[PDB]
Amino acid sequence: ASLLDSNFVPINFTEFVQAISNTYKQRRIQFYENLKR
Amino acid sequence: ASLLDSNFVPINFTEFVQAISNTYKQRRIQFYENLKR
Amino acid sequence: LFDENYYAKAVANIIGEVKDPIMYKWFSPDQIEDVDLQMGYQKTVKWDAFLNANPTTIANEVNTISTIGFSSEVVRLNYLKLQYKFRHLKQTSEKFYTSDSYIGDINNNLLPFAQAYKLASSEIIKLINHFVLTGTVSIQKDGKNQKRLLPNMYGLLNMPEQIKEEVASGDKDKMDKIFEKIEAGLSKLELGDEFSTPMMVIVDPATSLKLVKPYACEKWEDVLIQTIKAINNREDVYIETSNLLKHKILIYPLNSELIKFKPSKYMLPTPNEQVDKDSTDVAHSYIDFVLGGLLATRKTILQVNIKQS
Amino acid sequence: LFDENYYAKAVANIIGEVKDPIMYKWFSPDQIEDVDLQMGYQKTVKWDAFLNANPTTIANEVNTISTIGFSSEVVRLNYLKLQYKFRHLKQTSEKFYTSDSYIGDINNNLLPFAQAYKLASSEIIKLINHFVLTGTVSIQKDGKNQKRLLPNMYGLLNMPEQIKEEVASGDKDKMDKIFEKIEAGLSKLELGDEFSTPMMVIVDPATSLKLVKPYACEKWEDVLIQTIKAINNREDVYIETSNLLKHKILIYPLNSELIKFKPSKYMLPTPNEQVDKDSTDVAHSYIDFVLGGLLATRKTILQVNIKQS
Amino acid sequence: INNNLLPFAQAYKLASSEIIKLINHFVLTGTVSIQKDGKNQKRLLPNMYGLLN
Amino acid sequence: MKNPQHDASLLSNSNEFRDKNVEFFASGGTRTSKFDKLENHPFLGYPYKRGVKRVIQSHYEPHVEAGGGEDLYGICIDIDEFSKTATIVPITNNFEGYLVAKDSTVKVKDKLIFNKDGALEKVTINATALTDAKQISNEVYLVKVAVFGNK
Amino acid sequence: YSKSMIENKVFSSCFKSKNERVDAYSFACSSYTDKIEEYLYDPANSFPYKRGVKLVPKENSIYVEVGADTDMYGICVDVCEFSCTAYVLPITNNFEGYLVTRNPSIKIGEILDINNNGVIIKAGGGPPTAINIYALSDSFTINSINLIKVAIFGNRGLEKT
C-alpha cells in the first residue's frame, strides 16, 4: 500500500498514514538504487 | 502541434507560430538529451 | 476518505514534490532499518557466540566434547515526538485568492494548503538532517537555545565512548598538526575483524579549502585518503562537505555491523488529522515527526574538533 | 494554409537546417523554462518558510505549539520585442534565376526566400547568444553603439548585486595575481544550502592561453578546478571558451534553485506574416525575436575583470 | 422563552431580515450604523458610497 | 513521584466512591474547560502540583522549577517523567484543583501566596483556599484552591 | 511604515536564523483558544504593528493607539492595511513572540517595560513596571528596526522599580 499506486484508495486516516510511511520507504530504496558514488 | 510531425497541418498563421515554438522547444530538449560533458 | 478529507487528498498529490533528505548520503543502504514506534524506548538485544576450548578430534570413542558458549547485550534507544503548527488558507476560500499565475495573499503571506505543507515539510527535514549529524536541536546560527533532549539520543558528532581529538587554537591553520591528530585518532580506531568496509569522511567548508592545498604535486586530501585506505583494507573512501558543521571532521565506517541507524517509520514529516477551523478563511494544521534511533559500537567514530579560541 | 502561403511552407521545410544555439551549453536542462509573452513585464513570486521556535514535545495534554512562518519576494522581469527586415526573390521569379545547381543573382546578391531565411536566422541567433552572455546588444567588435535596453534586462556578465573583482592593469599578465582575486571572489560567494551543484567557467581566449601555462608539473587550470571543487562538494566543473568576452572570467553554478532562465517562448527567430510585394521580382520579409528572461539570486555570480589600462 | 433561545430555522430567518434592513440602509445612505442618532459609524473603505453621499 | 510504580502481591480493596480523589497521583484539575491554555516545558527538580517560575540562563532553552513570588509564572498540573516535561497552566488562566500546602495551618476562606518553594502559605494574593489542608503522606499537605491571578 | 514593504531586480540570498524578518509571524508559539480581536487604528498617527496598544473610544468608533504599560489593553500582532484594521491579543492572554524595541543592545532574561510609544525598553528606566515582560533572546536589528523575542504573562501585582 503506497501513494504511488493509482489503484490505491485509502479508507481512513490510519491507512493514509501507513501509505505515506511506505511511500517514504520506497523513495529511500529508489534513491540508493539510483545513487552512484 | 510540431513541425517535426509529418501529419501536422496548420490552419492559420497563429497555429504556424505555435508549431514553430513547439519545434524549438523539442529541439532544445533533444539537444540536452544528446549532450555529453 | 479522499471524498471527505480534502487535506488528505492534497497531501497525497503533493507528497512526491518534497526532495529526499541529504542524510541518506551518509549511510549505506543496509545501515537503515525502520522500526514501529512513535514515542518511547526500545530495547535491542544482540547475541554472540564464542569458543570455550580447542575443537575435539573425532576418533574411536569419546563423549567429552568441547563446547560453544553464547552471550547477549541489551541496548536501549529513546525516541521523541515533536510537532509544528502552520497557518494556511481554507479550501473553500482558495477560489477568491486565485490570482494570475499564482494563488495566495502576497500582503498577508497566506498560501494554499498544498504549497504550505510542501514548504513546511522541507524545513522540518532540514532540522532532522541537522540533528542526525550533530545530535543537537537549535534554530539559531549561534547554536544556542538548544532544546534539551533525552538520554540515549545521540548524533554522529556527540556520540560518547568514541575517539575524540582536539587541535589547539594555536595550530588552527597548520594542516600538518591537523593531519597529525587525524593519524593518532585513526590509530586509536578499533574496527576488529570488520575493517574491510568503505569509510565516510565529513568536513566543514573551512576544512575543505585547506584540504586541496599542496601537501607539505600531492594534496592533503590525497594523503588523507591513502591513510584511510591503509586501515580499511583499501576499500572506497568518500568525502562529503556539510555547512551544518563548523571546524569538525567526522570519520566512521559504513558497515552495518558497526554503525546502524534505526529511525522510526514516522520520523519524516507526517500530517495530523486535526485541523483548526473558524468563521474566517484562515486554518491551522499540524505536522509530526520523530527523532532518535542512532546506534554505534564503541571506539568506531573519530571526531576531530579544531578549537578556534 | 500551406496551400496558400508559400513562404510559410518554405519556412516549415527549412526550419530544421538552422543550427542549435550555443547558449544551451551554459545552462542545465532544468534551468530553462519558457514563458508566454511578447513584450512587457512579468512578476515572479518566490515563497519560503522558516522555523519560529524549537519544536514542541507532544506529551500528555498541550495546546501551545511552535509555529512555522512564511515569506514572499517578488522579482520583475522585462521583455523586449525586436525585428529585422531582409530582401529576397519573389516566389514566382525563381524559375528565371535557377542557374546550374545554384539559385540567385550572383551579381545582385539576391537569394530565394528559403536560403535567405536560413542565413538570416543564423545571424540573429548569434546576436541572441551575445546578449545572454553579456547583457548588451552590439554589432561591433569594440562593443560600442550599444542599443539602449530596458532595466531588469541583464546578462550573466552585468547582473547586479554580484561579486565583482577587478585586476589592476599592472598585473594584467601575472597569473598569480589573477588567481588571487579569483580566490577572494570565490570565498565571498554565497551558495547557502545549494552548494552541492555543478559549476561552469567561461573565459576569453587570452585567459585560456594563460591558464594552460604551468603553475608557478601542474597547470593553473588544474589548480582552478580543484579550488572550485573545494566549495561545490567535489562536483563537476566545466570550462568553456567564448570569443564574445574580452579579459573576463565568469563562474556561476548550474543550479535551477539559484540561477533560472525564463525566456519568452518566441525568443528564437520567427517569421512575420507581412510580406512586401510590388511589380518587380524583389520582395521583403520580417523576422521577430524577443530578448530578456534571465533571473538570478544575489551574490551567486563571480565576475572578474582584468583591466588592460 | 425564559432564556430567549430559538430553533436554528427561526433564528436564521430573523437574523437575515435584520441584516437585509441594514444593507438597504447602506445602499440608500452610504453609511453603516445601528443608532437612530446615526453616530458610531463603522469606518468604510474609500470608493464606497451610497446614493446620498 | 506522581505515580510510584511498585509491584504488589495482593489486590487493594477499592469499592467506596467517596474520599477517593484526594490523592497525590490525581493530576489535572477538578473542573477543566476545553478552552484552558496548556504549555509543556522542560523542568528541573520535581515541581509537580506546585507554583513554577521560568529560569533563563553550551546554552539551553529556558526551563521551569518550583518557585513563586514576583517570579511566579504558572502552575504545574501534570508531569511526564520519560520526556522530563511538565504541563503548566499559565498564571493568566484560572485553575481549580489540589495543590501543595506548606503546612496544616491553611483553612477555608484563607488567602494564599505561593512561597519560594511553590507551596501555598497563608498571607499580593494569588488563590483562595476552598478546603482544609489534608496530609496525604508524611509532610505532604494538599489543599483545594481556586487560582485567580495575582491580587 | 508598513509590514510587507517592492519589485526586485534579483532574488535575495541554512534553516537557522531565517525568522529575523519584520513581517514574520508574531507568535513564536501559538495556541488555539487564544482570543484575537479586531479594532480600527489611526492611519496617520502611529503604526501599531508589533506594539502595545490601548483602547481610545472616539466619537465614531473605538480605535487602538500605541500606549504605555500603565494603560495597555493588549498587543497588536497583525495589521491589514487595506482595511486599516489592527488585530489585538488582549493582555489577559499570554504571549511569546517578537516585538518592536528601541534599545539595540538587550540581553536574554532581562526585565522589560513598554513605553508610551508601545515600544519594549529596559525596565530600569525608572517608571514602575506593571506587566511581566522578559527577554527570551538578544535584540536584533533589521536593516533599521530593532526586534526582540519576549514573553508577556499578565500584570504584576505590585509595581516594581
Side-chain angles (χ1 to χ4, degrees), chain G residues 7-95:
Chain G
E7 295 165 356
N8 296 354
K9 299 172 176 179
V10 299
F11 272 131
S12 66
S13 314
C14 53
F15 66 106
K16 306 175 177 180
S17 300
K18 304 177 52 185
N19 66 43
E20 303 186 358
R21 305 188 51 116
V22 65
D23 52 0
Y25 182 75
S26 54
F27 297 71
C29 308
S30 182
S31 165
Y32 71 100
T33 76
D34 283 331
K35 183 162 177 175
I36 308 168
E37 289 174 352
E38 285 178 350
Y39 290 117
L40 303 182
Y41 70 80
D42 293 343
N45 285 121
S46 50
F47 192 64
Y49 183 56
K50 289 190 173 181
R51 295 200 189 183
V53 293
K54 63 184 182 188
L55 288 173
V56 177
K58 295 297 198 173
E59 326 180 3
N60 298 119
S61 173
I62 310 179
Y63 282 62
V64 288
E65 305 179 0
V66 294
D69 67 304
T70 68
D71 49 353
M72 193 183 103
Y73 180 64
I75 298 294
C76 174
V77 289
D78 197 1
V79 293
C80 180
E81 302 168 1
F82 176 60
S83 60
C84 307
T85 304
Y87 309 101
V88 182
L89 183 63
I91 192 167
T92 57
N93 296 3
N94 307 106
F95 181 71

Side-chain angles (χ1 to χ4, degrees), chain B residues 16 18 27-28 32 37, chain D residues 18 24-25 27 34 265:
Chain B
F16 184 57
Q18 302 307 305
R27 292 235 295 172
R28 182 217 316 158
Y32 277 125
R37 299 164 170 286
Chain D
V18 191
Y24 292 164
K25 311 170 57 185
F27 298 105
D34 285 354
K265 68 173 195 173

Side-chain angles (χ1 to χ4, degrees), chain D residues 28 37 48 94 114 119 157 167 182 195 204 212 260-261 279 292:
Chain D
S28 74
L37 183 65
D48 309 295
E94 293 177 4
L119 298 180
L157 192 61
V167 179
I182 295 175
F195 69 114
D204 62 292
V212 302
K260 182 101 176 188
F261 186 57
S279 60

Side-chain angles (χ1 to χ4, degrees), chain A:
Chain A
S2 176
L3 294 190
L4 302 196
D5 287 341
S6 300
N7 299 354
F8 167 64
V9 175
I11 305 181
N12 61 67
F13 213 76
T14 306
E15 293 185 1
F16 182 60
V17 173
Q18 288 301 300
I20 292 184
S21 301
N22 299 353
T23 304
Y24 272 132
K25 179 183 180 180
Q26 292 179 0
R27 287 227 297 175
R28 184 182 70 211
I29 295 171
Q30 172 170 353
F31 165 87
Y32 274 124
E33 284 179 358
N34 300 358
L35 168 72
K36 31 191 179 181
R37 298 164 179 286

Side-chain angles (χ1 to χ4, degrees), chain F residues 117-135:
Chain F
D117 301 357
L120 284 163
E121 64 179 2
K122 196 162 183 170
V123 179
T124 184
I125 61 172
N126 292 118
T128 303
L130 305 182
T131 64
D132 283 1
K134 321 164 190 183
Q135 171 198 358

